[PDB]
Structure formats: structure tokens, C-alpha cells
Amino acid sequence: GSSGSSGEISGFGQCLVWVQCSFPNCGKWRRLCGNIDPSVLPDNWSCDQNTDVQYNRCDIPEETWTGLE
Numbered sequence: 001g002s003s004g005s006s007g008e009i010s011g012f013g014q015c016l017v018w019v020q021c022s023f024p025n026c027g028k029w030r031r032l033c034g035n036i037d038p039s040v041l042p043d044n045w046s047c048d049q050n051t052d053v054q055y056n057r058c059d060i061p062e063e064t065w066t067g068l069e
């Protein structure tokens with residue numbers, strides 16, 4: 001594990017946002033670019049409203065759990 005230090009000039013300090021589909025059967029958390037907020041986003045947002053083509057559908061599965069042992 002590693003602590004995400006916030007202040008070091010070295011390293012990527014980009015943010016990360018997640019949006020949950022509006023449909024119940026979905027309820028999946030899609031990944032957006034990074035300059036998007038839920039406050040400005042619509043209430044009926046869905047996977048089809050995703051920026052990542054890799055996960056811009058309601059049929060695409062959620063990002064599998066990653067993590068080295």
C-alpha cells in the first residue's frame with residue numbers, strides 16, 4: 001500500500017470521479033475523464049452518458065477489483 005501524498009511536485013496528482021448509473025439493474029459506477037462533477041451532472045445520468053467508450057454502455061461490466069498481493 002501507499003499513501004497518496006498531496007503536495008509533492010513529483011508524481012501524478014490528477015483527481016478521480018465516479019458516477020453511478022440511474023437504472024437499478026445497472027447501479028454500476030462508471031469512470032469519467034476527471035473534470036466532471038455530480039453536482040453539475042444530471043439526475044437521470046446513465047452509462048450511455050459516459051466519456052470512456054470502454055464503459056459507456058449499460059451492458060459493460062464494472063471495473064474488476066485490482067490489487068497486487
Ligand SMILES: [Zn+2]
Nearest residue numbers: 021026047058
Ligand atoms: Zn447503466
